Copies of this chain bind each other. A is one copy, B any other.
Amino acid sequence: MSYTLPSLPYAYDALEPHFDKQTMEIHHTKHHQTYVNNANAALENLPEFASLPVEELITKLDQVPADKKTVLRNNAGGHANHSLFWKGLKKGTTLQGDLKAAIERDFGSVDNFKAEFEKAAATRFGSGWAWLVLKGDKLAVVSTANQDSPLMGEAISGASGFPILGLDVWEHAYYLKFQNRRPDYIKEFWNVVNWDEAAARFAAKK
């Protein structure tokens, strides 16, 4: 009830040849759906939380009943992260404008940022996410475990900041095409990171 699997900005094959259509379909119809379903299941008993946007719910995980924290952290996190991820994917964009300049300001150069992002994405051990976040006035690359989001805050996720964009580095995001070669997937991410959406999120939050 509370959450719905969001309508994608695109068909499953829209990120070809970079992100494989089989994975995008499963990622949405199976993995994301499951996060929505399991978050919804957990929120049935929590009407005072079920109304929150998922992105707000995950900032309030410390307010949930103890026995709800993990399931919603994982599944509302998964829902939030995947919802962001899809909107954060698009071919044909160019990093530009204020976001490019902020990246250049905060990382020294786009290449420095990319290397830092790639390093975070590659070094995330196990499942998780690499993020470009905005922490007040400064962009940062952080990473989170599993479906943790920086929106969850430091205490829960070990990261914080508003996610400008993120890269799913769960193996389900890349295994079918890339298998263990997560760096290749990370490189491909640069071809599909939706800088227009990242720029819009930066514009909203900067």
Task: Spell out A's residues near B (CB within 8 Å).
Answer: 26, 30-31, 34, 70, 74, 125-128, 145-147, 170-172, 175-176, 179-180
Chain B residues in 8 Å Cβ range of A125: 70, 74, 146-147
Give the oligomeric copy count: 2
Given B26, B34, B126, B180, which contacts A126 in the complex, CB threshold below 8 Å? Answer: B126
Chain B residues in 8 Å Cβ range of A176: 175-176, 179
Chain B residues in 8 Å Cβ range of A126: 74, 126-128, 145-147, 170
Once the chains bind, are A179 and B30 in contact (CB under 8 Å)?
Answer: yes
CB nearest to A171 among chain B residues = B171
Q: How far is the CB of A38 from chain B (nearest CB, A)?
A: 10
A180 vs B176: C-alpha distance in the bound complex, in angstroms? Answer: 11
Once the chains bind, are B26 and A179 in contact (CB under 8 Å)?
Answer: yes
CB nearest to A73 among chain B residues = B125
A47 vs B48: C-alpha distance in the bound complex, in angstroms? Answer: 55
A34 vs B31: C-alpha distance in the bound complex, in angstroms? Answer: 27
Once the chains bind, are A180 and B34 in contact (CB under 8 Å)?
Answer: yes
List, sorted by A's number, 20 A–B pairs whose CB atoms are closer than 8 Å: A30-B180, A31-B180, A70-B125, A74-B125, A74-B126, A125-B146, A126-B126, A126-B128, A126-B146, A126-B170, A127-B127, A127-B171, A170-B171, A171-B171, A172-B175, A172-B180, A175-B175, A175-B176, A176-B176, A176-B179
